[PDB]
């Protein structure tokens, strides 16, 4: 688990980008009230 690359600004629209290294995926931790892969949708 580590910081997302700087390349990823705006992948996680309303959330925070997380770089799961060993597992080789990026994850958006969504702000409360936002869902989606990129935290794109509300409620």
């Amino acid at each position, epitope marked *: 688990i580590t910081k997302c690359s700087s390349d*990823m600004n705006g992948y996680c629209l309303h959330g925070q980008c997380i770089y799961l290294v060993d597992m080789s995926q990026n994850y958006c931790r969504c702000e409360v009230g936002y869902t989606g892969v*990129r935290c*794109e949708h509300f409620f």
Partner: antibody
Amino acid sequence: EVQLQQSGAELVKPGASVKLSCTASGFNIKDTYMHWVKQRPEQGLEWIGRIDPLNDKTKYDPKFQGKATITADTSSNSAYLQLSSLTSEDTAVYYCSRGGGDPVFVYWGQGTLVTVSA
Amino acid sequence: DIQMTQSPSSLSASGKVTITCKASQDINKYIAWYQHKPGKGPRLLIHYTSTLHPGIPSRFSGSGSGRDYSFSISNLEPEDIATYYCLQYDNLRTFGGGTKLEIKR
């Protein structure tokens, strides 16, 4: 399961223009940056650029600005590379790939050959 | 924007080869190393400098920090004769020039 499938080979008069397509199975391109990558024969890998199909914004490697235009159609789950004023320099295989969820390229299309020749 | 130089362009050993890669800016460990072959897409081996990618043999061994990086195969049994690309992704994307391997005889 991830599939990227690109359109067929192209043969283009020099000076002309072509528009390649990449269509994605197994995921929504709204949730991902779609990238295009050039490989000119016997030569390595050139990163062409990317689009965000969600907001249609784009970035390009400055070597390609003016030459490439990357678009997306969320409707058909497709991204497109369009190359203007073709020269023999543009004669290459073009690969699409995805980013966002993938920190780096992992899945690719089968590649599309563009042969610029009269 | 941000340049990548991968030495050497080709080499031969029969062995233990390692490839270098240095970058215009330092890229905070966001490099990856690809292995390319005829008609195939470039398969990813190593991401984040060192972290092996789920389902890859443990002889591949990237390394480094800052502007300067390494990639090493243990021994090219036999599949691993091919071309190798370093890729930064700290800010946009840039491929290294590549490294083609031959079998020294």
